[PDB]
Amino acid sequence: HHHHMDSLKKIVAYKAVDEYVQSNMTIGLGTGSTVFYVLERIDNLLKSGKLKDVVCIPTSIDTELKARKLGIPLTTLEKHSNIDITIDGTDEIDLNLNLIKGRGGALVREKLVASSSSLLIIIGDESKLCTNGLGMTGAVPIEILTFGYEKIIENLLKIYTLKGCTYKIRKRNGEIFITDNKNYIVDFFFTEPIQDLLETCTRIKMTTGVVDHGIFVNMTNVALISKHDGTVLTLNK
Amino acid sequence: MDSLKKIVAYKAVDEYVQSNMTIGLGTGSTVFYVLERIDNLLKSGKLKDVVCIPTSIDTELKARKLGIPLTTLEKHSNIDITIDGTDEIDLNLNLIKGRGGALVREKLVASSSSLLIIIGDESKLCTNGLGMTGAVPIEILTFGYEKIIENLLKIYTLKGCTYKIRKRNGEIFITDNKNYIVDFFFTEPIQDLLETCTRIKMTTGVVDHGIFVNMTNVALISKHDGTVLTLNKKY
């Protein structure tokens, strides 16, 4: 139900802005179709004067372009930067508030900005909420260098918890997808939930050729999940 | 130093490089004569059916121009032998590399190799601790780089350091992987070397770093007296 899903996205997005974003804040902006309504709302409130002195840091080039068209003030991640709040979406989230992210290709700058913020708010419709184990609804992305990427993938497959996976290099329009950071992404697929989750993150990240991966562990402070019945579930660390 | 570079480069090729090998090609001014010499031997017929993988675009072009057969690092490539230079090497045969900008590809190529051979002159051999002779390079994203640096300075072993973003021709150097490099400088030897390695690598926004631990099998060190010291780690 497409307008319905849109409305559900809208609801959580408006809520994150209305309830958590304040004037004179620096705000990290996530990526994707849910976050769209975050940009909409922030621009709305800024134009009305309900909000003032709000500057944003974008997690992708897509998000930067959209924000700039709207006229939302933007800055950049410097040594002095500290972000009050980042609002982003996710591809999956469990009841521990651990996330699978990156299916829109923005995972690396999403993690950097989110780790650089006092508060990470993750927003989603109820299909993102996965209560029977992470990693089974789709791609678990890993950003890797273009140079020698197949060798990097073979090395990833040694990791004991990934040895059973299938995988596909990410493609758009029959071309290998290139990230903002000029890397490639390999999607690993799991038929059972990802085992020893934190050890997996660590072994992926320690891999030569790996830039980062789409698993965010112990980073989410708040989640707002919009349910079909009208409700919004708030989850806190 | 150049004839000292020539001698270790020729020794390295002549004594380890065989026909039918896949060869990792390093980067820089010593490795220029590895290239030179591999050309010579394929062309003479002394060597054959040797194919190469370059650790930089710079090395690729020079080799492509010499007529060295080149291939890419594919799913189950094994490199028989990589030959590279180094900025520092100690007697554990641990290295500091990347002062020419190529640390990341160098590292991946070398780790994909059955044997890593490090060549250099006397000045590279560091017997009083690693990391004091110049840049210790950390490859990082261009996005939010100032913030990645700040997060690197949280590491207890880096906290003290002088550091400088890497420039060349008045501009921030851009690596073959389209990243930046931040150089760290130490006045004492790097502490807790492996821990430091790990904490850098685990840093969000870090691609890799130029500390190469337990990866070198053989080093050839050209001496001022013209001889070459060969170091060999079985371990």
From Swiss-Prot, chain B:
Q: Which reaction does it catalyse?
A: aldehydo-D-ribose 5-phosphate = D-ribulose 5-phosphate
The pathway it acts in is: Carbohydrate degradation; pentose phosphate pathway; D-ribose 5-phosphate from D-ribulose 5-phosphate (non-oxidative stage): step 1/1
Q: Which UniProt keywords apply?
A: Isomerase
**Keyword set includes Isomerase:** yes
Q: Where is the active site?
A: 106 (proton acceptor)
Coiled-coil annotated residue ranges, if any: none
Spans traversing the lipid bilayer: none
* GO molecular function ontology, one term from the record: ribose-5-phosphate isomerase activity
Q: Name one GO biological process term.
A: pentose-phosphate shunt, non-oxidative branch
Q: Where does substrate bind?
A: 27-30, 84-87, 97-100, 124
Q: Name one Pfam family in it.
A: Rib_5-P_isom_A
EC primary class: isomerase
Q: What is its EC number?
A: 5.3.1.6
| Tree of life domain | Eukaryota
What is this protein's function?
Involved in the first step of the non-oxidative branch of the pentose phosphate pathway. It catalyzes the reversible conversion of ribose-5-phosphate to ribulose 5-phosphate.
Q: How does it assemble?
A: Homodimer.
In the record, the note on similarity to other proteins reads: Belongs to the ribose 5-phosphate isomerase family.
Protein name, UniProt field: Ribose-5-phosphate isomerase
